[PDB]
Amino acid sequence: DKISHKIDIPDSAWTIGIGEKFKNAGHPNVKYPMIDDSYVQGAPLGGFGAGTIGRTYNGGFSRWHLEIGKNKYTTVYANQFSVFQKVEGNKDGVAQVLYAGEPENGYLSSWKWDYPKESGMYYALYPNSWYTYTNKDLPVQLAVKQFSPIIPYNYKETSYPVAVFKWTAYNPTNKNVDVSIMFTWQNMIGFFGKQVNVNSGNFNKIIKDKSKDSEIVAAVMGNISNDNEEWNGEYSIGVKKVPGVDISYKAKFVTTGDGSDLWHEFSKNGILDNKDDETPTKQDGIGSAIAVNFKLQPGQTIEVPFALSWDLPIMKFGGGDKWYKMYTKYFGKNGKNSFAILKEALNNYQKWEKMIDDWQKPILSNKSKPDWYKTALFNELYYLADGGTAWENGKVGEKRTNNMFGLLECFDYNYYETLDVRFYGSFPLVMLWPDIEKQVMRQFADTINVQDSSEFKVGSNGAMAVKKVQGMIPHDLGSSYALPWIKINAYDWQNPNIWKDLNSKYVLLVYRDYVLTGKTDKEFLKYTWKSVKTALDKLKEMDKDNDGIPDNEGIPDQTYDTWSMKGTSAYCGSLWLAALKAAQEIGKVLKDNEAYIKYNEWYKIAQQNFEKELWNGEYYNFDTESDHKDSIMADQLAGQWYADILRLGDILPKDHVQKALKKIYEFNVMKFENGKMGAVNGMRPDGIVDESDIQAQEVWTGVTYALASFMKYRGMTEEAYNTAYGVYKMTYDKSGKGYWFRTPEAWTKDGNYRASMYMRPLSIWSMEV
Residues that bind Ca ion (CB under 5 A): 543, 545, 547, 549, 551
Rg of the chain taking only CA atoms, in angstroms: 27
Residue nearest to Ca ion (CB): 543
Does 547 appear as a known binding residue?
yes
Q: Among candidates 629, 624, 625, which has minimal Cα distance to 684? A: 629
Provide the minimum distance between the beta carbon of 609 and Ca ion in the complex, in angstroms, as a whole number.
8
Based on CB atoms, which residue is closest to Ca ion, 311 or 551?
A: 551
Closest CA to 737 of 722, 754, 721, 720: 754
Establish whether 549 is an annotated binding residue. Answer: yes
Side chain identity at 653, as an amino acid letter?
P
Please give the span between the terminal C-alpha atoms of the chain, in angstroms, as a whole number. Answer: 39
Q: What is the DSSP letter of 496?
A: G
Cβ proximity to Ca ion, 97 vs 570, nearer residue: 570
Closer CB to Ca ion, 548 or 736, in the complex: 548
Least CB distance to Ca ion at residue 548 (A): 7
CB of 551 to Ca ion, least distance (A): 4
Q: Between residues 605 and 769, which has the closer beta carbon with respect to Ca ion?
A: 605
277 is in an annotated binding site: no
Task: Write the secondary structure of 687-724 as one string of H (helix), E (strand) and C (coil).
Answer: CCECCCCHHHHCEEHHHHHHHHHHHHHCCCHHHHHHHH
Amino acid at 754: R
Question: Is 513 assigned to a binding site?
Answer: no
What is d(CA 4, CA 724) in angstroms, rounded to the nearest whole number?
30
DSSP state letter for 485: T
Residue 728's contacts (CB-CB under 8 Å, 6 or more residues apart) are 372, 373, 375, 376
Picking from 76, 69, 38, the residue whose alpha carbon sits closest to that of residue 55 is 76
CA 394 from chain center: how many Å?
23
> How far is C-alpha 644 from the geometric centre of its chain's CA atoms?
26
Of 247, 240, 305, 234, which is closest to residue 274 (Cα–Cα)? Answer: 247
Closer by beta carbon to Ca ion, 1 or else 545? 545
- For β-strands 80-87 and 94-97, DSSP reports them as antiparallel
For Ca ion, the closer of residues 475 and 540 by Cβ is 540
Determine the Cα angle at 664 with ends 694 and 722, to 5°.
100
Closer to Ca ion at the Cβ: 8 or 545? 545
CB of 545 to Ca ion, least distance (A): 5
Residue 551 assigned as binding residue = yes
Smallest distance from Ca ion to CB 614, Å: 12
CB of 539 to Ca ion, least distance (A): 11
Reduced to 3 states (helix: H, G, I; strand: E, B; else coil), residue 583 is: helix
Least CB distance from residue 498 to Ca ion, whole Å?
14
Query: Which residue's CB is nearer to Ca ion, number 433 or number 622?
Result: 622
User: Residue 606 Cβ, how far from Ca ion at the closest point, in Å?
Assistant: 9
| Residues forming a β-bridge with 324 | 314
Binding-site annotation, residues: 543, 545, 547, 549, 551
Binding-site annotation, residues for Ca(2+): 543, 545, 547, 549, 551
